[PDB]
Amino acid sequence: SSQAWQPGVAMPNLYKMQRMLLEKCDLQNYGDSATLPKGIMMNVAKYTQLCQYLNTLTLAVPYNMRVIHFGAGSDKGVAPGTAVLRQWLPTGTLLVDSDLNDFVSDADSTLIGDCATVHTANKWDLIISDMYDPKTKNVTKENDSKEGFFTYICGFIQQKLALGGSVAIKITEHSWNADLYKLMGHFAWWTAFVTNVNASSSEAFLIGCNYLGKPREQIDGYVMHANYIFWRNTNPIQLSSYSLFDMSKFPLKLRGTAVMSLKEGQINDMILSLLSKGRLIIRENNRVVISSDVLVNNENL
Amino acid sequence: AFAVDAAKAYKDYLASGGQPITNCVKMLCTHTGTGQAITVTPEANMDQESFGGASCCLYCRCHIDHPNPKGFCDLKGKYVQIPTTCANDPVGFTLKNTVCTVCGMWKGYGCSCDQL
Ligand SMILES: Cn1c(=O)c2c(ncn2[C@H]2CN(C(=O)c3cccc(CN)c3)C[C@H](O)C[C@]2(C)O)n(C)c1=O
Ligand SMILES: C[S@@+](CC[C@H](N)C(=O)[O-])C[C@H]1O[C@@H](n2cnc3c(N)ncnc32)[C@H](O)[C@@H]1O
Ligand SMILES: [Cl-]
Ligand SMILES: [Cl-]
Ligand SMILES: [Cl-]
Ligand SMILES: [Zn+2]
Ligand SMILES: [Zn+2]
To answer: Which of this chain's residues are annotated to bind Zn(2+) 8 (chain B)?
Structure first.
């Protein structure tokens, strides 16, 4: 095994290389639940294992890091995931979160509204999304690439992710988007990461590690999603909460990664190599300013 | 001259037998930390639980103004350590208790400045 002591399981490279057709997701442990530590919420556990896995990758971690977290509100009116990110990230990290409905958060700033209403002047070092609409879990209709907030996320990445930065975007069997998988090939590396506490779900986090701003590899996202489902359909993951009990190495290490402003002409192979290794972030280092578009209407008559 | 007093309302609701505010965000941590009351990262010791601060602030959770004339929140964006024996009501605990400004521990739950 050993997998039960990891924070979760990443999609093996060989499955990414296949050309499967999309099938229905059938998980052998569907409906089962892991035994969480006393009084710990699923979303705390889930984000903790996500961050434990991210600790094994080459994330750029600059001074005055900037992180934005979409889909950060729960049905309880609080932000468990944001609380875990803030614990994980270096003290002082600029953390912004957002959701459709109102919620109380530990983030430095919180924007309430549809993600498409969110605008930011600055570029980001890390983008996290838990956005999800459970109405997509409809088995009676065809499973096509979804748009909606995924269209926003793809544009936000191409427009506001610093070179060198990373993303983790929540997907499921039915909540997925082909262009986002395609964008995974614009990173130095990528995977679909399943948490051991939620291994009985088709949920995964699509992680793009060290953004390069151009296609390093061409990915058909319809095929890749089929490949992801094929992996899940043929590789049961044992539910496990083991990694939650060892938090001694949890903090993300402040690597002091260098930040430079650079123009398209200066992005050469040396730079591209540093980006790909988690050793360089490219973006301005100005002040972080965000806003939320507000629609104005007068209903009186 | 009129201001709602939510602190007193929650205290009276608790005394009358009302159920404590739930869904305070409890963190995973080593529980080998300093034990200080309110910290920038979880610092629970063996006898505490650490929680996300905003979720333990009555004013944050009720969507009301903070008593600070600046409206600043003591807990938001930080972590609060609650004695495990009181972890069923973190909001009540933070409301009713005060932090020692010298050692940073909860008065009566770790502060020993008044010893000797
Ligand atoms: C929506 N959905 C699934 O529906 C699913 C699923 N993986 C396997 N399944 C099963 C579920 N089955 C049940 O009986 C069942 C149904 C509902 C709730 C529970 C809770 N115990 C169990 C057995 C069926 O014969 C085959 C089937 C439908 O595929 N995934 C990933 C998924 O998202
Ligand atoms: C699984 S939940 C959020 C859980 C949260 N991360 C936590 O830590 O508990 C899914 C969230 O996605 C948000 N969201 C979903 N669709 C959205 C959209 N188009 N725009 C903005 N937010 C959206 C929902 O309001 C909803 O709270
Ligand atoms: Cl492909
Ligand atoms: Cl650039
Ligand atoms: Cl409440
Ligand atoms: Zn508050
Ligand atoms: Zn003291």
So the answer is: 100, 103, 111, 113
Contacts of A84 in chain B (CB under 8 A): 27
Q: Which residues contact A172 (CB under 8 A, 6 or more apart)?
A: A132, A136, A137, A201, A202, A203, A204
Nearest to B102, CA basis, from B85, B83, B115, B84: B115
The residue in chain A having the minimum alpha-carbon distance to the alpha carbon of residue B53 is A106
Residue A67: which of A129, A135, A147, A3 has the closest Cα? A129
Rg of chain B over CA atoms, in angstroms?
14
The SS3 of residue B7 is: helix
Q: Please name the method used to determine this structure.
A: X-ray
User: From the CA atom positions of chain A, what is the Rg in Å?
Assistant: 19
Q: Which residue has tokens 């507000």?
A: A294
Domain ranges of chain A: 1-301
Number of structural domains in chain B: 1
Tell which atom from ligand 1 comes closest to the C-alpha of A201.
Answer: 31
Rounded Cα–Cα distance for residues A129 and A237 (Å): 23
